[PDB]
Amino acid sequence: MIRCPKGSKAYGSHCYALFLSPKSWTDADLACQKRPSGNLVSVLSGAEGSFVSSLVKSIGNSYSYVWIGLHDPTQGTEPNGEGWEWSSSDVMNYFAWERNPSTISSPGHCASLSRSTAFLRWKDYNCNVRLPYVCKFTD
């Protein structure tokens, strides 16, 4: 049945935790890495996206964006807009962009969940902005 450390929640074979003390994308992912096989959350299916949405939906109006583990280390130079990858190195096998970055001139190079989409869809976002964030890890 999957158990998790007190303070996180189980889904599938992973544990998930929302952190409200805001960090840049890089610093948030580094914080997640303190946990066993930890990284910013990767969203690998619609079902997982729904779970993550439910984890964060009660966050409160102080917050409209939450970091997830997707970033573009090509900083937009990938010829197709497809340099995006999960920090966990999982295959990108599910896509839930609010707006596809390939349609935006000079998009942000990290991705967040947006309150406007009930935290179900991804918004390109400035990596240097400090946001709350969700970690996905094993126990």
Q: Nearest approach, Cβ of 63 to Zn ion (angstroms)?
A: 24
Residues binding Zn ion: number (CB under 5 A) = 4
Interface positions, 93-112, toward Zn ion (CB under 5 A)? none
- What is the per-residue binding string for Zn ion in 29-68, x denoting contact by CB under 5 A? --------x-------------------------------
Extended beta strands in the chain, E state: 9-11, 14-23, 39-40, 65-71, 85-86, 110-114, 122-125, 131-137
Which one, 22 or 76, has the nearer CB to Zn ion?
A: 76
Name 101's Cβ contacts closer than 8 Å, sequence gap at least 6: 72, 76, 81, 84, 107, 124
**Interaction site with Zn ion (CB under 5 A):** 37, 73, 76, 85
